[PDB]
Amino acid sequence: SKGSAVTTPQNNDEEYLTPVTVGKSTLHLDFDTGSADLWVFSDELPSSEQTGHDLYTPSSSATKLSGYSWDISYGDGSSASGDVYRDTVTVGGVTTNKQAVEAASKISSEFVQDTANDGLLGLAFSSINTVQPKAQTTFFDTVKSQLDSPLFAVQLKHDAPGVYDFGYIDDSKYTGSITYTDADSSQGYWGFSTDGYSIGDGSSSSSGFSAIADTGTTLILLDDEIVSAYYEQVSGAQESYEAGGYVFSCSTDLPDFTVVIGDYKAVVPGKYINYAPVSTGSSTCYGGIQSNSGLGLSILGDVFLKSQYVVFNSEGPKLGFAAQA
Ligand SMILES: *[C@H]1O[C@H](CO)[C@@H](O)[C@H](O)[C@@H]1O
Ligand SMILES: *[C@H]1O[C@H](CO)[C@@H](O)[C@H](O)[C@@H]1O
Ligand SMILES: [Zn+2]
Ligand SMILES: [Zn+2]
Numbered sequence: 001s002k003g004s005a006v007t008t009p010q011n012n013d014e015e016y017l018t019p020v021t022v023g024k025s026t027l028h029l030d031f032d033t034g035s036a037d038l039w040v041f042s043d044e045l046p047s048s049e050q051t052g053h054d055l056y057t058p059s060s061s062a063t064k065l066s067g068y069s070w071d072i073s074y075g076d077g078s079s080a081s082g083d084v085y086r087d088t089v090t091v092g093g094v095t096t097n098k099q100a101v102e103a104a105s106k107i108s109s110e111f112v113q114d115t116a117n118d119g120l121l122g123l124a125f126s127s128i129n130t131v132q133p134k135a136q137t138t139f140f141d142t143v144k145s146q147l148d149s150p151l152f153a154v155q156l157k158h159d160a161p162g163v164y165d166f167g168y169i170d171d172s173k174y175t176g177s178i179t180y181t182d183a184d185s186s187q188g189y190w191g192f193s194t195d196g197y198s199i200g201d202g203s204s205s206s207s208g209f210s211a212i213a214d215t216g217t218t219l220i221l222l223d224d225e226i227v228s229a230y231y232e233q234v235s236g237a238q239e240s241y242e243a244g245g246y247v248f249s250c251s252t253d254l255p256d257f258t259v260v261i262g263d264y265k266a267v268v269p270g271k272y273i274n275y276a277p278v279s280t281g282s283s284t285c286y287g288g289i290q291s292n293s294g295l296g297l298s299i300l301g302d303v304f305l306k307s308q309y310v311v312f313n314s315e316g317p318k319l320g321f322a323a324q325a
């Protein structure tokens with residue numbers, strides 16, 4: 001068994017949604033390789049919270065996990081909690097009837113006021129799922145032995161639908177060979193260790209660093225020392241507080257950011273680090289690379305992933321990288 005599903009980005013690629021059949025209802029979930037919970041909007045929510053969102057409707061065979069509960073919080077003061085159900089979930093043709101579904105009956109603003117987003121599908125390691133009293137398996141993990149190969153690949157596109165492959169690699173999605181690196185699951189994430197980086201045509205930095213691959217995150221969050229070195233090559237850039245991070249003229253084209261992985265160069269086009277205007281029709285533009293200060297962890301998000309074909313292989317574990325076709 002294998003399958004592929006299409007993912008379309010919101011506005012300026014701020015969150016990629018993917019159709020997923022949960023129960024009998026079809027929802028549009030956000031695939032996050034940074035978390036391990038699968039939660040959706042439930043009927044138990046306030047009507048004014050439901051508005052703008054498809055809600056989860058149990059199957060006739062589903063079974064409510066009595067006594068269990070789940071609660072999660074993310075990067076910002078963004079929470080969600082609720083009950084747990086054992087229903088059927090279908091993603092790109094791969095089906096399972098023992099997937100745990102986390103129904104939310106209480107959530108934060110960010111979620112409620114994000115019409116269209118109907119919840120999340122976590123693809124990190126199951127060890128960090130938050131269900132209680134017994135943690136549950138992610139979807140991938142749950143269908144792992146139904147897949148021709150125990151892996152999945154992602155191909156995110158800029159301002160265009162990408163794709164999530166389950167259990168197989170589509171050779172038409174990348175050019176040249178796949179380079180593999182050992183994944184560090186120590187914190188429950190798909191971590192890895194780049195050997196260095198390179199700003200524009202500069203000379204690569206032998207000094208490596210530890211990073212996680214988080215599809216659920218829009219930007220590239222690195223250590224301040226690196227950010228500062230980067231924007232030093234962007235004319236007119238400034239640490240505009242009361243705006244989030246660094247900004248510069250939209251007309252400016254920033255240099256590429258290369259991430260060295262063994263002998264492979266994962267080059268993020270400068271064009272993608274010119275994220276978007278701080279305001280409608282604004283003159284200045286927000287950068288794709290900001291500071292990870294406050295998380296203490298380096299994250300390579302959608303901006304980095306928009307140029308790679310990434311393979312998440314449970315065997316090792318390991319991550320594979322290839323220049324997107
Ligand atoms: C309850 O839900 C299941 C899943 O869609 C169906 O197979 C059944 O016929 C009934 O609608
Ligand atoms: C950014 O653009 C300015 C243009 O004034 C240059 O002076 C600088 O070296 C960098 O290329
Ligand atoms: Zn198959
Ligand atoms: Zn929807």
Ligand SMILES: [Zn+2]
Pocket residue numbers: 032033034035214215216217
């Ligand atoms: Zn995430």
Ligand SMILES: [Zn+2]
Pocket residue numbers: 256269270
């Ligand atoms: Zn370039």
